[PDB]
Each structure stands twice: as C-alpha cells, then as structure tokens.
Design an enzyme around this catalytic site. Structure first.
Site, PDB file in Angstrom:
ATOM      1  N   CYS A 171       0.843  -0.763  -0.079  1.00  0.00           N
ATOM      2  CA  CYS A 171       0.016  -0.341  -0.079  1.00  0.00           C
ATOM      3  C   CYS A 171       0.798   1.098   0.071  1.00  0.00           C
ATOM      4  O   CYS A 171       1.892   1.032   1.167  1.00  0.00           O
ATOM      5  CB  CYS A 171      -0.722  -0.199   0.837  1.00  0.00           C
ATOM      6  SG  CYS A 171      -1.774   1.368   2.077  1.00  0.00           S
ATOM      7  N   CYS A 206       0.057   3.931   2.176  1.00  0.00           N
ATOM      8  CA  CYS A 206       0.605   3.905   4.090  1.00  0.00           C
ATOM      9  C   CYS A 206       1.874   4.140   4.308  1.00  0.00           C
ATOM     10  O   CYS A 206       2.302   4.747   5.422  1.00  0.00           O
ATOM     11  CB  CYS A 206       0.659   2.352   4.028  1.00  0.00           C
ATOM     12  SG  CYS A 206      -1.610   1.382   3.904  1.00  0.00           S
TER      13      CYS A 206
END
Ligand SMILES: [Cu+2]
Ligand SMILES: [Cu+2]
Length: 108
Positions: free
Chosen positions: A32, A35
C-alpha cells in the site's frame, strides 16, 4: 515507531476494545503506497496527542482476520475508537493537516 502499539488479530480485543479512552488504529500493508507516506505522520501525531490518544498499527497481510470485522475494503484505513467503540474512520492517503483536523473534530 517508539510510541506505536503493534497489534495482531490475537491482541486486538485486549489492546483496542479493552483500552480506555481513545485509540487510533492504522490498517496497512507493505503493498500500500499511501500507507508508507502516512507512517511518519503517525509518529508525529502519537507524540503531539500523547496523553489524549494512543496510536496503533495492524498489518492486514499478517493479521487478515480483523479488517473484515470493520468492513474495511481499502487501505490505509484509520479507525478512531473511544472506549472500545468506533467513533469515526478515514480511508486513504491524507496529509498531516487533514489528520489533525480529523482528530481535533473527534477528540476534546
Ligand atoms: Cu517512534
Ligand atoms: Cu508484527
């Protein structure tokens, strides 16, 4: 990373649902991109809000059981709990200012 609680599927109930007060949980994974961008911001927030907020992380690849219990379909997802119940959530990349705006709107 010194003020971030490391969560697992096995510890989530004790560390989050049975914690007193406010806890911000970041659901993340290595694949991700956003993230990674929010990770240093969470360290800043964990210090700035110390005494009012605990900050925690759950890696959904290693702990795949918890996210479906909150209907999480995208990451990063931030869940803000107060006394063991979700008060507010945010999905996706956000800036430091957006994160502080979210917290200030939901924490006294
Ligand atoms: Cu740290
Ligand atoms: Cu771990």
């Amino acid at each position: 990373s010194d003020k971030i609680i490391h969560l697992t599927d096995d510890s989530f109930d004790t560390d989050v649902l049975k914690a007193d007060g406010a806890i911000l949980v970041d659901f993340w994974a290595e694949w991700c991109g956003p993230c990674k961008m929010i990770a240093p911001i969470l360290d800043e927030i964990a210090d700035e809000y110390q005494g009012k907020l605990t900050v925690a992380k759950l890696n959904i690849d290693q702990n795949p059981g918890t996210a479906p219990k909150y209907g999480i379909r995208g990451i990063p997802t931030l869940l803000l709990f107060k006394n063991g119940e979700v008060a507010a959530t945010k999905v996706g990349a956000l800036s430091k200012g957006q994160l502080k705006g979210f917290l200030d709107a939901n924490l006294a």
